[model samples]
Target: KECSINRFQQVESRWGYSGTSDRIRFSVNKRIFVVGFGLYGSIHGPTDYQVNIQIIHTDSNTVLGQNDTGFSCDGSASTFRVMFKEPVEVLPNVNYTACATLKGPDSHYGTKGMRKVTHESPTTGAKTCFTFCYAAGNNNGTSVEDGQIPEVIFYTE
Candidate 1:
């Protein structure tokens, strides 16, 4: 599998404020299965953290896939990835959003890359993608200039 977002040369941390959902808007160049995403674990805990995951169609605001099982995370301040119960397929060139809500221990997730503007590339990798919008409130929150949902995990069919 390959990551779906650009690996920014330099990035910063943004709290995944407990109970608030952080999301990113992006579009793939081809068909792919979004299986999971990466985020930091609880800031203060025994390396046991939990999160809820979701994939949505940005245009219609429809949830294509979701996981609410309190997915466990095993580390902190690192790329903690969690998979969906059923992978969500994203069609070519269609905008979509992937989101995660840090559920416990008041964790800090997405110590990730960031950029002020949307990015696009025709040739990075078969799986590498870019983002156009990001937010940290309810699902589909307002887009911010310095927002990102890190390390989206996906694969081609």
Candidate 2:
């Protein structure tokens, strides 16, 4: 099995900013896996933040399953690679999207999540095969600095 970056997008949210919520979408083929994430902070400061990954139906946009994670920003950059305990199956020839969100004050930078499409192959077993990344807080939004999530990954059996 092989993997590739199909497409990518970014969403930004701020405390007193105009729009404080964002979502990104990714298109994939049949039987794909989510490896991990690459998270970072755009602004140069310290803060707290969180991110969540949800699998939704392409047509109705209903949530199938979701995983939430968070991290802390020290003004530089960082990455979190996730390996899911279990792998999820993707419907053949179906289109799906992953949404990323940021909370707090720091305005971070990075991709919400990463994914790859693969076919049934000989070496394809219950192992990791994708990676995604995103950024969280920066020390300006909220005082409650808990609930910062980390990267997560998933695959098929």
Candidate 3:
């Protein structure tokens, strides 16, 4: 059997603090190439928090991948790259999505956050990504809170 590649869509979260986390979905049939993303936190205080990335099977919501990392967006802005332990293969044309959630002591701030998603062209292999920003500041601070989630590039060949 032969495989065909398809482009993935970027999911954007809403601008407000949902008090929970948000998720972005992708088609299951095609292999997903998460090129990269940018993560932003409030500028008022340091973002000493841990962010979790989970891959959920859209149909069953089963977690395929669960990874966590500590982040501190202090001083100015900070950026991080997500490299998977191994590239993932989807169940040919299945529906899937990635979810991000803040955990531990950091969740108390209830500040605005954002993450961008990048995808590569299945044919030409050209890459593209997008950014999602939030308006509210974190930790009840009144600063124009902003941060950039850097782009992550994945090599699928």
Candidate 4:
């Protein structure tokens, strides 16, 4: 992954200086066992540096499900991805917001990247379609971007 989209604001939109990430995009289906996602971030001190992952229903803004794991990136060896032990069935039509939070003293996260506005717009409506997030880290843990849509993948059964 060349570009790491932000789950919050553009501190660079490259890599998360901490162990947490804002949000990525995805959609779950019936009988789908969503494996896990990649962790392309770093931690403040390291050691068990991890990210908290979650899936939210955009409309209701309710968290469908989530988890926190040590599967993450660091100054050392990084897998770049992780899997979930239990997968859930997602509601149709209601897209999801994949959120990540790294664990550590001062963890921030940066993942697969891309920018929508460049120097103009704030990015919206399928700009990269795949990545072109409506707003970078709009739904970032601290705040939520009303219509933010970042890019992500959901491996299934």
Candidate 5:
């Protein structure tokens, strides 16, 4: 038999960056090729953004990788890219989470929707936070006043 791997799955997250910190968690137990990720929405002016992407372990408190970087914009874009020179790998059953923070005083994040399903990454239970509309902003807590959630979904190559 062969230990086949799920090489690819899922992109992009968008939300208002008024304060700081908003992220999503994920879990992957195979090796895949991550080409790049996508961004949505726009800035107010000749603004810029700093983003952080993380993949962590659940039990051992280990890691997959942590990407801390920034992006520049002229205030308007529906889709953007954060390319990696090489592919990001994963550890089997490590329970990884993913988050992208768009630098902001104010900005519009990418937007989308979903019914709900078993999300393998981030928090395995609250898969709804993986969507842009129900995304977890500034700490994956109870969420905002409304039903809006800020999220970043993983896009495959």
Candidate 6:
């Protein structure tokens, strides 16, 4: 509970290898500090996947935090946390988007919990919020109706 923050739920499916990036569009009901983003590992081997992650303030399209590195997955249903150089603060009711671009080994994703509108409450705090929309491969790719949201690692401020 120290370095983790709740999002929707565990990813129940996998997205095949592609050049497209995936994004989780959401906002908080209270203030929180974002430290890192989560990406599901391949269930193939104790493999390493290179990924570039970013947290953007949706309205301004400005990047809040970013990290590009390698993540190791031991063929489990694990969503690994790739931390930023520092924590980024998020204000209540403002929309933000956390996106990731992974290089190979496939990827795990969620679908059963996606919502088209903001969540009425927080996932776990006095800070309930929603991942109202998901943009899979935005710009260079395309947006799907559901699924493809990455998890987030955060702390309450």
Which predicted model would earn the best lDDT? Answer: 6
TM-score, cand. 6: 0.79
Q: Model 6 over residues 1-157: C-alpha lDDT tens digits?
A: 3345444454554566576667767777767788887667786886888778788999888998888876888877767877788989988888888777778686565544545333232455454454455543462221334344345677776
Q: What's the distance in Å from true for residue 46, model 3? A: 3.4
- Ranking of all predicted structures according to TM-score, beginning with the best and ending with the worst: 6, 1, 5, 4, 2, 3
Best by TM-score, which number? 6
C-alpha RMSD in Å of predicted model 6 compared with the true structure: 3.8
Per-residue lDDT of 12 in model 2: 40
Compared with the true structure, what per-residue lDDT tens digits does model 4 show for residues 17-75? Answer: 24445565544322233445555434332444555677667657787667766643354
Which lDDT values do the candidates have, in the order given?
A: 0.61, 0.41, 0.41, 0.43, 0.41, 0.65
After superposition, the stretches of candidate 1 with alpha carbons farther than 4 Å from their true spots are 1-16, 71-75, 109-127, 136-148
Model 5, 1-157: lDDT tens per residue?
1111111122233346654545444444333444335544354557666766454454465645556666666666344555444455654344444445555535444223332223343433322122112234454231322211233234322
Each candidate's number of clashing pairs is 0, 25, 13, 26, 21, 3
lDDT of 5 at 140: 29
- Candidate 5 wrongly placed segments (more than 4 Å): 1-14, 27-31, 91-94, 115-157
What's the lDDT for residue 146 in model 2? 13
Write down the lDDT that model 3 would get: 0.41
Instruction: Give the higher-TM-score candidate: 3 or 6.
Output: 6
- Tens-digit lDDT track of model 3 for 33-105: 5433334443435555566665567667687776676456552333334434454555545655545554423
Q: Report model 4's TM-score to 2 decimal places.
A: 0.50
Q: Model 3 off-target regions past 4 Å? A: 1-19, 28-30, 33-37, 75-79, 82-85, 91-93, 104-153
